Design an enzyme around this catalytic site. Structure first.
Site, mmCIF file in Angstrom:
data_model
loop_
_atom_site.group_PDB
_atom_site.id
_atom_site.type_symbol
_atom_site.label_atom_id
_atom_site.label_comp_id
_atom_site.label_asym_id
_atom_site.label_seq_id
_atom_site.Cartn_x
_atom_site.Cartn_y
_atom_site.Cartn_z
ATOM 1 N N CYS A 66 -8.617 -15.826 30.257
ATOM 2 C CA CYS A 66 -7.805 -14.948 29.420
ATOM 3 C C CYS A 66 -7.612 -15.479 28.003
ATOM 4 O O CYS A 66 -7.052 -16.562 27.818
ATOM 5 C CB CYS A 66 -6.425 -14.749 30.041
ATOM 6 N N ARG A 69 -3.562 -15.577 26.199
ATOM 7 C CA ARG A 69 -2.533 -16.456 26.756
ATOM 8 C C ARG A 69 -1.446 -17.007 25.796
ATOM 9 O O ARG A 69 -0.473 -17.599 26.263
ATOM 10 C CB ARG A 69 -3.194 -17.612 27.516
ATOM 11 N N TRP A 238 -2.122 -5.598 26.571
ATOM 12 C CA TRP A 238 -2.732 -4.534 25.777
ATOM 13 C C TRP A 238 -4.210 -4.880 25.677
ATOM 14 O O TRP A 238 -4.588 -6.012 25.977
ATOM 15 C CB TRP A 238 -2.098 -4.440 24.392
ATOM 16 N N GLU A 243 -13.251 -4.708 24.680
ATOM 17 C CA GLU A 243 -13.278 -4.347 26.095
ATOM 18 C C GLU A 243 -13.619 -2.865 26.243
ATOM 19 O O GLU A 243 -14.280 -2.451 27.194
ATOM 20 C CB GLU A 243 -11.932 -4.632 26.756
HETATM 21 C C1 HEM Z 1 -1.274 -9.404 26.058
HETATM 22 C C2 HEM Z 1 -2.504 -8.872 25.982
HETATM 23 C C3 HEM Z 1 -3.682 -9.434 26.686
HETATM 24 C C4 HEM Z 1 -4.941 -9.485 26.183
HETATM 25 C C5 HEM Z 1 -5.368 -8.986 24.822
HETATM 26 C C6 HEM Z 1 -5.775 -10.074 27.169
HETATM 27 C C7 HEM Z 1 -7.146 -10.248 26.980
HETATM 28 C C8 HEM Z 1 -7.979 -10.517 28.058
HETATM 29 C C9 HEM Z 1 -9.389 -10.329 28.058
HETATM 30 C C10 HEM Z 1 -10.186 -9.783 26.888
HETATM 31 C C11 HEM Z 1 -9.852 -10.704 29.282
HETATM 32 C C12 HEM Z 1 -11.270 -10.757 29.830
HETATM 33 C C13 HEM Z 1 -12.200 -9.577 29.549
HETATM 34 C C14 HEM Z 1 -13.594 -10.107 29.272
HETATM 35 O O1 HEM Z 1 -13.787 -11.299 28.925
HETATM 36 O O2 HEM Z 1 -14.582 -9.350 29.375
HETATM 37 C C15 HEM Z 1 -8.736 -11.151 30.021
HETATM 38 C C16 HEM Z 1 -8.889 -11.629 31.300
HETATM 39 C C17 HEM Z 1 -7.778 -11.929 32.059
HETATM 40 N N1 HEM Z 1 -6.482 -11.831 31.675
HETATM 41 FE FE1 HEM Z 1 -5.735 -11.343 29.994
HETATM 42 N N2 HEM Z 1 -5.062 -10.367 28.260
HETATM 43 C C18 HEM Z 1 -3.769 -10.039 28.043
HETATM 44 C C19 HEM Z 1 -2.669 -10.136 28.909
HETATM 45 C C20 HEM Z 1 -2.712 -10.660 30.204
HETATM 46 C C21 HEM Z 1 -1.641 -10.757 31.108
HETATM 47 C C22 HEM Z 1 -0.243 -10.224 30.849
HETATM 48 C C23 HEM Z 1 -2.120 -11.406 32.246
HETATM 49 C C24 HEM Z 1 -1.393 -11.731 33.497
HETATM 50 C C25 HEM Z 1 -0.087 -12.007 33.575
HETATM 51 C C26 HEM Z 1 -3.508 -11.680 32.013
HETATM 52 C C27 HEM Z 1 -4.369 -12.329 32.872
HETATM 53 C C28 HEM Z 1 -5.758 -12.250 32.736
HETATM 54 C C29 HEM Z 1 -6.631 -12.606 33.864
HETATM 55 C C30 HEM Z 1 -6.210 -13.107 35.224
HETATM 56 C C31 HEM Z 1 -7.896 -12.421 33.452
HETATM 57 C C32 HEM Z 1 -9.139 -12.647 34.302
HETATM 58 C C33 HEM Z 1 -9.370 -11.441 35.231
HETATM 59 C C34 HEM Z 1 -10.584 -11.576 36.145
HETATM 60 O O3 HEM Z 1 -10.972 -12.681 36.582
HETATM 61 O O4 HEM Z 1 -11.221 -10.556 36.489
HETATM 62 N N3 HEM Z 1 -3.805 -11.251 30.759
HETATM 63 N N4 HEM Z 1 -7.582 -11.045 29.267
HETATM 64 C C1 LIG Z 2 -20.488 -9.937 33.223
HETATM 65 C C2 LIG Z 2 -19.181 -10.025 32.747
HETATM 66 C C3 LIG Z 2 -18.857 -11.009 31.829
HETATM 67 C C4 LIG Z 2 -17.553 -11.079 31.365
HETATM 68 N N1 LIG Z 2 -17.256 -12.024 30.479
HETATM 69 N N2 LIG Z 2 -16.608 -10.212 31.791
HETATM 70 C C5 LIG Z 2 -16.888 -9.241 32.679
HETATM 71 C C6 LIG Z 2 -15.906 -8.330 33.143
HETATM 72 C C7 LIG Z 2 -14.624 -8.251 32.285
HETATM 73 C C8 LIG Z 2 -13.482 -7.867 33.049
HETATM 74 C C9 LIG Z 2 -13.557 -7.796 34.444
HETATM 75 C C10 LIG Z 2 -12.434 -7.440 35.196
HETATM 76 C C11 LIG Z 2 -12.509 -7.355 36.601
HETATM 77 N N3 LIG Z 2 -12.923 -8.605 37.263
HETATM 78 C C12 LIG Z 2 -11.231 -7.137 34.551
HETATM 79 C C13 LIG Z 2 -11.114 -7.200 33.162
HETATM 80 C C14 LIG Z 2 -9.863 -6.860 32.550
HETATM 81 C C15 LIG Z 2 -9.170 -8.042 31.837
HETATM 82 C C16 LIG Z 2 -7.921 -7.756 31.188
HETATM 83 C C17 LIG Z 2 -6.703 -7.953 31.853
HETATM 84 C C18 LIG Z 2 -5.488 -7.709 31.195
HETATM 85 C C19 LIG Z 2 -4.276 -7.884 31.861
HETATM 86 C C20 LIG Z 2 -5.481 -7.279 29.872
HETATM 87 C C21 LIG Z 2 -6.714 -7.106 29.236
HETATM 88 N N4 LIG Z 2 -6.742 -6.684 27.966
HETATM 89 N N5 LIG Z 2 -7.875 -7.354 29.892
HETATM 90 C C22 LIG Z 2 -12.256 -7.568 32.426
HETATM 91 C C23 LIG Z 2 -18.190 -9.144 33.178
#
Ligand code: HEM
Ligand SMILES: Cc1cc(N)nc(CCc2cc(CN)cc(CCc3cc(C)cc(N)n3)c2)c1
Ligand code: HEM
Ligand SMILES: Cc1cc(N)nc(CCc2cc(CN)cc(CCc3cc(C)cc(N)n3)c2)c1
Lengths: 363, 363
Positions: A66, A69, A238, A243
């Protein structure tokens, strides 16, 4: 003990760490005994409100993937361990959507339901996100979001029917302990903010008739805190613009809009060396940020987000905490080399509390 | 034996693998004995021309970070283990540049010099690439390429002097066994192809007066084959456009041209949400591919390159070879999610033969 011994060790580690951060260091011994007896008596233990809130915040802080954070300590935590009925669960989920959306000024929020007991779920949520679009394949080509195809098929097995537009809202779907089948409830449209996608300079862009929902609310991960498994604990932030613009609308396995984007912005989509995909990606991503800002819906661009994460890094070092991260998820899918993240490495070790994947109930 | 035992095991593994691929399977026993006695006698062994060529090709095939590996088997290998003098070394390096450039139709080529003996280098090359620009810092701001600052300072310690343009060619610099100081020779300008950077649509782009050299020739890595260390073994391919447009010209720690690009293409460089950096990156990268193609100098765009690497993957599975790769280097720094590489994982195990980093002689 083996199962209960695992619980005990996790609880010892969490309580020490949690109370230290909260300054409650001198209260650790007393709490640890109470917990010990409660495990010997009931096979488990109950978190105090303070432990639960801080546990959820820690879990976010430790989420390697994330980039958002920096704001971990401001997570709004809603304690719903008191729910027992499906109407209560449904109403808690409606409430989460409303309070997190907050008229567009999005509040990062988690709602926490009763944890698993003997590995027995009290509440089993089927949705991947609380708000998501359905997906269909009977080929007149595909319709909607292909990533929702399996869940959509399961909902329609249970008596729901989508309108088969490219943007059907899926209903909430969850199962209660003791029930063989889950229930579903349609989302009230007044709860869900959506944003039409327009471009700041290119009028033709609206011809694509694109839109996305305002708030991503992850509802299928398990929150683990101190050996306790909260399998049902939906959370939201948000969006980062990429994304939506670089993945949801752009991926060939998702909405696959790049060729249509190229046509409306008036470039040829014929030659790799023209970088038409890269060009289309940028204008699409500009349109997304512009559209969310114009409507008053919170969003962050990947440059600002990376700057914020640099501050998280600095904050971690300043507080003596080891930093963990997953470089492959932290870099943005657009211009990653323009961010500092790209030019350093991160330790991908798993620290608890944390959010984890769990098996889908369907497919 | 310990040092010589390591050599023996590496040689056993390489010869078996190499001869199997060459179909020379029945010749392994005889060659292995000859090698065994030669190690017992001299403390080392000499590769046949076939073993050396195939060894170098294998090494490229095993380079986890390289997206251009589809063409591994067409590597042009020049055997220069016969050189003994600095004039011979210099002339071999001039020849490599000429034959690899090939009037713009670039040939992937490696020139192989005598290997280390007792860990004693016969030839020590100081250049990172055979053709690279110098870099200076006496601040009237920086001049040239900051990545060349330390080597440039070392050359100027040895009596060379750059003109202090942003594009001074560094001289070749290398040290012979037995000499305390290296020698340097200026590159003949007729050997070095350079490409002026213009844009297909934007006339103002030439006002930046950007250029780059045609051929990247890595000259500071060690090629290891069968326990033999070729510390001096320069190799080249042709560029992928992003290396020039997204890194060399764009990085803040390199030429840092994005703000100037934004100004000539007529967009404001004020707001993160305008994605001006992303936009500038795309036009710069379009200019690079266009300029190389117009001049008749080989180059590949990142989309075509990724398509080629997908074929390398398929070829590997088809031949029963395990595939290795470094996901963090294989993804392009521009639109990585638009390539298939981004959406899969790779095993980053190290297989030999291979190319390795070694300590710099200077700084
Ligand atoms: C405040 C705004 C937030 C933004 C902008 C944000 C941004 C992101 C992004 C861009 C990703 C991964 C998407 C990708 O790399 O393709 C992500 C993954 C994640 N975020 Fe955040 N996030 C936010 C809030 C939160 C909150 C509130 C939580 C939990 C309390 C959280 C927990 C996670 C987790 C657990 C992942 C990994 C999910 C997975 O393994 O599938 N995030 N976040
Ligand atoms: C191939 C691949 C690479 C990569 N970096 N990321 C992805 C998927 C990105 C992804 C996947 C899941 C489900 N496992 C969920 C998310 C959502 C993450 C998220 C979570 C929260 C809480 C806020 C926010 N803005 N974004 C992103 C796929
Ligand atoms: C034919 C054209 C070639 C192309 C287009 C190509 C492309 C690339 C690219 C883009 C990189 C990494 C840059 C980055 O990710 O930022 C790379 C790395 C590498 N390539 Fe290739 N390459 C080619 C030929 C060769 C040849 C001929 C060899 C050796 C025989 C080679 C060996 C390597 C090695 C060893 C690395 C990693 C270098 C390091 O660790 O610093 N490549 N290649
Ligand atoms: C932070 C960072 C990430 C990353 N993926 N790549 C880099 C550097 C890329 C790089 C580095 C070196 C020196 N270690 C050398 C190269 C040149 C690779 C190369 C080699 C050859 C032979 C041909 C060709 N087109 N490209 C690229 C830095």
């Amino acid at each position: 003990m083996e199962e209960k011994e695992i619980l005990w060790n996790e609880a010892k580690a969490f309580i020490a760490a949690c109370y230290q951060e909260l300054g409650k260091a001198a209260e650790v011994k007393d709490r640890l005994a109470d917990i010990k007896s409660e495990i010997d008596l009931t096979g488990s233990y109950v978190h105090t409100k303070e432990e639960l809130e801080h546990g959820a915040k820690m879990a976010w802080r430790n989420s390697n993937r994330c980039i958002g954070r920096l704001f971990w300590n401001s997570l709004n935590v809603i304690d719903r361990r008191d729910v027992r009925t499906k109407e209560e669960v449904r109403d808690a989920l409606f409430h989460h959507i409303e309070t997190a959306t907050n008229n567009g000024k999005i509040r990062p929020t988690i709602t926490i339901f009763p944890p698993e007991e003997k590995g027995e779920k009290q509440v089993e949520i089927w949705n991947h996100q609380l708000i998501r679009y359905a997906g269909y394949e009977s080929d007149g080509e595909r319709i909607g979001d292909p990533a929702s195809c399996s869940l959509t098929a399961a909902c329609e097995e249970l008596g729901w029917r989508g309108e088969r537009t490219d943007f059907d809202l899926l209903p909430l779907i969850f199962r209660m302990k003791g029930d063989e089948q889950p229930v579903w409830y349609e989302l009230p449209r007044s709860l869900v903010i959506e944003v039409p996608i327009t471009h700041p300079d290119i009028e033709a862009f609206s011809d694509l008739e694109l839109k996305w929902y305002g708030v991503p609310i992850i509802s299928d991960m398990k929150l683990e805190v101190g050996g306790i498994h909260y399998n049902a604990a939906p959370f939201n932030g948000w969006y980062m613009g990429t994304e939506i613009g670089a993945r949801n609308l752009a991926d060939e396995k998702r909405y696959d809009k790049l060729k249509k984007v190229a046509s409306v912005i008036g470039i040829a989509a014929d030659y790799n060396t023209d970088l038409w995909k890269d060009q289309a990606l940028v204008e699409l991503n500009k349109a997304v940020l512009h559209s969310y800002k114009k409507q008053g819906v919170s969003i962050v661009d990947h440059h600002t987000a990376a700057s914020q994460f640099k501050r998280f890094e600095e904050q971690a070092e300043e507080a003596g905490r080891k930093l963990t991260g997953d470089w492959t998820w932290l870099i943005p899918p657009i211009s990653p080399a323009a961010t500092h993240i790209f030019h350093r490495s991160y330790d991908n070790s798993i620290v608890k509390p944390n959010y984890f994947y769990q098996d889908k109930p369907y497919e």
